[model samples]
Target: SMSVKKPKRDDSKDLALCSMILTEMETHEDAWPFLLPVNLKLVPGYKKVIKKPMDFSTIREKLSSGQYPNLETFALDVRLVFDNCETFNEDDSDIGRAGHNMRKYFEKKWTDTFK
Candidate 1:
């Protein structure tokens, strides 16, 4: 449920909190937080903890080498897509208004690029 037009503008993309970034939210009226491009490293790829947050043990284990480029692209794509449109559940509650907002996102995904 995401779409990202590739060929980043020399770091053309930025991260926005997915829910706050969605079209359905009131925050979308203020464009600054959503439009400003942010560095990829700024994102925290961590795990859900009981009280505190931390990077996933599995991700940390496999990526002990610190070579994080492989995970960078996919994560960014999701961030960009969510920036465009946040996801929702079924049963005509929140996301039911306009349907899944992030549909057709694969059309913009660069899946075939680095793979």
Candidate 2:
């Protein structure tokens, strides 16, 4: 009788891919609004509506600090940034459009790399 071997997690590869995705997203034309945390002072309702706020800078910090145990965790934060935008901005608004565009770009990159 033999026991099945468990596959070890390859965090280094995941971390590197996540970092590359973040870098590309940061350079995207529509990345301006999502580059940093939303200013609660300017957008008063933001805090009230968005329980979880995510941004590019925060993601970068998390990635650097080894907060993301896997690629899926990293993707959650990236999606959160876009989700928060959708929740706060109107679909036709500039920021909303940017969010949609960025999300599309991220999804494609994610699938291409992972799949």
Candidate 3:
């Protein structure tokens, strides 16, 4: 992963990934080896169950409209694409909290390890 915006020394994202692994999936027993790229646990598992490899035309079909029709719906579809196969049951608050936890981990790791 090449990057221009990343600072010289940053451990926050790493820390965030680690925290998600330890806190969210450690006890699940089934999420080992097959760790998610993101901290989202349950959603990824479901995504694996539902998703398959795609072709260019299929990809184009999903985005054929060109312009994003509905911002909120587009966001939901984006999440579902990566979410292990589960949809938010109620609202989107979990995303905010999970993101906060990840960011907190990032900040803590940056301060503790990068310094």
Candidate 4:
């Protein structure tokens, strides 16, 4: 099994980057690959269930309309887009690292990795 070092969790940092990543995704062309739909099989009984692709447009609209209302909800939806997919779950693929770097940026209060 391959082991990966998980970034230390911090609500403040996560929320901050969650906001940053969502904003950035609005303009990044490559971000679409990270938004691909995932099969439910990896999730047990949920496996056979068909799920729709992650929709950033709805997220942007909600955020604009202040629908999230709190850091927890805002961050939850942001992470949901990427983390919901098993392929991007680990920091092994470029997409995964894109996520890892975003978290690191907020954790560190800023960085040039994603640039």
Candidate 5:
């Protein structure tokens, strides 16, 4: 026999992590490229909206509303952004290097936080 259990949702912690990522987006130029896709994916009909970008505040609102489910979902979305970026090559420009590092960082964070 098996039983299903509902996981606890911590709104404050989810909002805190989202805020941290938003701060990175606003503060780090390299971070914007990595964070944008997650923002779009989280927003309602943002993909269809096309031209009108989703603001950080709205993203925060969505996260606080608990639509995101968990921090792991957020972290996975971040990694997806980096994975879609140009492939890493040590011989290539700084962009590739940064993308590689950022992707690995998110991967580690996701693994660490969940396990």
Candidate 6:
């Protein structure tokens, strides 16, 4: 009989890492635009364009609720916010620039911490 003990998939470290990253993002200088969901009434056609709207606050809640099973899933939602921003705003625009800055910061942190 084989008696090798396999390792369990531990997600606690990943969850802590994700939580830390989220807190940093929430405090980022350019995080204002991405902090909350885009107001549909304030920005017409937003709902039609951004099928899956994402924001820092939403991500934080999801993280606390244990919605993300792994680091990749958490990263997906984070990327979605930037993707939606790029799709809705011009590169040279204020909000668009903020998105780019925040995304750059996040990618760098992700690489430094995870990769």
- Can you write out model 1's per-residue Cα lDDT over 40-63, one digit (the tens) per residue? 355443121112221223223324
Judged by TM-score, which candidate is best? 2
* Predicted structure 1, TM vs. truth: 0.22
Off by over 4 Å in 1: 1-68, 71-88, 96-99, 111-115
Ranking of all predicted structures according to TM-score, beginning with the best and ending with the worst: 2, 6, 5, 4, 3, 1
Q: Deviation in angstroms for 17 in model 3? A: 14
- Candidate 3: Cα lDDT at 95: 47
Instruction: Itemize residue pairs with steric clashes in candidate 6.
Output: none
Candidate number that wins on TM-score, 1 or 4: 4
Q: How far is candidate 6 from the true structure (C-alpha RMSD, Å)?
A: 2.8
Best by lDDT: 6
Model 5, 6-69: lDDT tens per residue? Answer: 7856556655756565455446555554444435556565456344333334455556677677
Q: What is the lDDT of candidate 6?
A: 0.92
* CA-lDDT, candidates in order: 0.33, 0.92, 0.37, 0.55, 0.53, 0.92
**RMSD to truth, every model:** 13.8, 2.3, 13.7, 11.2, 7.5, 2.8
lDDT of 5 at 115: 46
lDDT of 1 at 33: 28
Per-residue lDDT tens digits for candidate 3, residues 1-115, read: 6565655654335433433423432243433322333333644453454444222232234445443343333333433433422232222555444433443443464355334
TM-score of each model, paired residue for residue? 0.22, 0.91, 0.24, 0.44, 0.48, 0.89
Over the stretch 39-110, how does candidate 4's per-residue lDDT look in tens digits? Answer: 354546433432434556766667667687666676556556655544435568766766665544433433
Q: How large an RMSD does model 4 have?
A: 11.2
Off by over 4 Å in 5: 1-12, 35-67, 87-91, 104-115
Candidate 6's error at 3, in angstroms?
11
- Name the lDDT value of residue 113 in candidate 6: 83
Q: Native-vs-model 1 lDDT?
A: 0.33
